Amino acid sequence: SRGLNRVHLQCRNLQEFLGGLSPGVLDRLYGHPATCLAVFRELPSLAKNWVMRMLFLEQPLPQAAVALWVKKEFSKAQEESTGLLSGLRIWHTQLLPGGLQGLILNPIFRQNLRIALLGGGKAWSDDTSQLGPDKHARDVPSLDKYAEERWEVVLHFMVGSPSAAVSQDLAQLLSQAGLMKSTEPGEPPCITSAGFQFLLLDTPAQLWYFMLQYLQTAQSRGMDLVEILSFLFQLSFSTLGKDYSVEGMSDSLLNFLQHLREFGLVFQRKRKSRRYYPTRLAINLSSGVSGAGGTVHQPGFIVVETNYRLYAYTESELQIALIALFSEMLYRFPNMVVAQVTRESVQQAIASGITAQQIIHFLRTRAHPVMLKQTPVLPPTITDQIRLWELERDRLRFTEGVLYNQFLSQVDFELLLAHARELGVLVFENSAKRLMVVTPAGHSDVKRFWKRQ
């Protein structure tokens, strides 16, 4: 993985991003709309059952009640939830409030935990975004086309803008997460190695990371306003606000609203005001970790006979610019016979990255054609040929460094090897010829240790 492991699982990315935030921002995060998200995104039952324990108990409990609640045949699963206890960063171990090592949760989060489960009040039904009492009365299939257009524009920036001329700043945004790579001889950015896998599963889990990308700056942006705004589209459809958000807003709320609309999770009316309605893709974000859909017959079907892998053709306007972005295949006279002489076109794209797991994922999981009709394994004997093409780019290495030669003793060269290894500037060592490669970044420090020993 090159930057997508934290996207498949949502409960792991939220705990990692929470550890590197400001203490004043985390205080405002502990609200009533955030209580239904730190538990629903989880999966194990042990990490979810401890939330109800800290709600009824008013006094801190020691660790003796925890080591006994596992009875005798359950402490093995207790160590798995130990690392997760520090991920949410909501508990606190005291000294001895009534026994030994008393565990207590932040009372700021405990107050808002009962509002969204048992107790209530009034401010919860007054603020917008989190509520917004408004029904839907607009053509639903007419708005589904705008949800696909928001994601199609992103595809143009990954290729090089073949026919788009919008002013959306989306090329630099995806470059921070390692998805888009800036072209060195030119100026339109291309795509990285991890960007190919995003155009395969087509899951709305990646759009959740794009919303928290602007918050990573930690300058003048708060999380309490983003968390209360992201809860709008999480309630599927029939969750609006008419014009209640217009009266209660500011300059910071309008900035995050324009960026979320361009992602493909919510649709906004003209003039960037009036009534807003979330898209259809936001339903799959709260359902599971992935999803499928978009076809009813699946006309595509590959070949499992030869080795050039005849890719599928004739589908829609999505697979036309998608295969050319992978490795730029070829086409003949009829209905665009793609991938017919794959021998040199694949090696052109592998020279800029080790894109080996994305081609196999696109060859095996493209529309589920062979695994439903046929029975044996989809790839024949190409699993070894693909690995051979990746090893061809390992025959050389373009890196700089300095070499030290002509020593005197053998036991003296072994001491110098530990100097470059601890600092992290050592690449390759040789005890038979007394040779060591040192990167130029730490060249001014290795020469000092040799003059003293």
What x-and-dash track marks residues 50-69 binding another protein by CB under 8 A? Answer: --x---xxx-----xx--xx
Stretch that binds another protein, among 185-193, 210-218, 328-336, 360-368 (CB under 8 A): 328-336
If the CB atoms of residues 18 and 235 are measured against another protein, the closer one turns out to be 235
Residues constituting the chain: 453
If the CB atoms of residues 156 and 309 are measured against another protein, the closer one turns out to be 309
Is 231 a binding residue for another protein by CB under 8 A? The answer is yes
User: Shortest gap between Cβ of 364 and another protein (angstroms)?
Assistant: 14
- Binds another protein (CB under 8 A): choice among 303, 367, 382, 435: 303
Rounded Cα gap, residues 447 and 255, in angstroms: 52
Is 99 a binding residue for another protein by CB under 8 A? The answer is no
If the CB atoms of residues 113 and 257 are measured against another protein, the closer one turns out to be 113
User: Shortest gap between Cβ of 26 and another protein (angstroms)?
Assistant: 22
User: Shortest gap between Cβ of 177 and another protein (angstroms)?
Assistant: 25
If the CB atoms of residues 192 and 230 are measured against another protein, the closer one turns out to be 230
Is 321 a binding residue for another protein by CB under 8 A? The answer is no
- Binds another protein (CB under 8 A): choice among 153, 304, 322, 324: 304
Is 310 a binding residue for another protein by CB under 8 A? The answer is yes
The interaxial angle of helices 357-364 and 382-391, nearest 10 deg, is 160
Stretch that binds another protein, among 118-126, 250-258, 357-365, 397-405 (CB under 8 A): 118-126
- Binds another protein (CB under 8 A): choice among 18, 84, 85, 117: 117
- State the Rg of the chain over Cα: 28
For residues 234 and 286, the answer to whether their CB atoms sit within 8 Å is yes
Parallel/antiparallel/unpaired status of strands 91-93 and 426-430: unpaired
- φ and ψ at residue 7, rounded to 5 degrees: -90, -35
If the CB atoms of residues 68 and 432 are measured against another protein, the closer one turns out to be 68
User: Shortest gap between Cβ of 451 and another protein (angstroms)?
Assistant: 54
What x-and-dash track marks residues 32-51 binding another protein by CB under 8 A? Answer: x---x--xx----xx-xx--
What x-and-dash track marks residues 161-200 binding another protein by CB under 8 A? Answer: ----------------------------------------
User: Shortest gap between Cβ of 116 and another protein (angstroms)?
Assistant: 6
What x-and-dash track marks residues 348-367 binding another protein by CB under 8 A? Answer: --------------------
User: Shortest gap between Cβ of 54 and another protein (angstroms)?
Assistant: 11
If the CB atoms of residues 162 and 334 are measured against another protein, the closer one turns out to be 334
User: Shortest gap between Cβ of 199 and another protein (angstroms)?
Assistant: 24
Is 335 a binding residue for another protein by CB under 8 A? The answer is yes
Q: With helix as H, strand as E and coil as C, how does the chain read?
A: CCCCHHHHCHHHHHHHHHCCCCHHHHHHHCCHHHHCCCCCCCCCHHHHHHHHHHHHCCCCEECHHHHHHCCCCCHHHHCCCHHHHHHHCCEEECCCCCCCCEEEECHHHHHHHHHCCCCCCCHHHCCCCCCCCCCCCCCHHHHHHHHHHHHHHHHHHHHCCCCCCCCCCCHHHHHCCCCCCCCCCCCCCCCCCCHHHHHHHCCCHHHHHHHCCHHHHCCCCCHHHHHHHHCCHHHCCCCCCCCHHHHCCCHHHHHHHHHHHCCCCEEECHHHCCCEEECCCCHHHHHCCCCCCCCCCCCCCCCCCCCCCCCCCCCCCCCHHHHHHHCCCCCCCCCCCCCCCCCCHHHHHHCCCCCCHHHHHHHHCCCCCHHHHCCCCCCCCHHHHHHHHHHHHHCCCCCCCEEECCCCCCHHHHHHHHHHHHHCCEEEEECCCCEEEECHHHHHHHHHHHHHC
Is 441 a binding residue for another protein by CB under 8 A? The answer is no
- Binds another protein (CB under 8 A): choice among 85, 199, 235, 417: 235
What x-and-dash track marks residues 238-267 binding another protein by CB under 8 A? Answer: xx----------------------------
The interaxial angle of helices 107-115 and 45-56, nearest 10 deg, is 100
Residues within the interface to another protein (CB under 8 A): 32, 36, 39-40, 45-46, 48-49, 52, 56-58, 64-65, 68-74, 116-120, 124, 131, 135-136, 231, 234-239, 286-289, 296-297, 299, 301, 303-306, 310, 332-335, 337
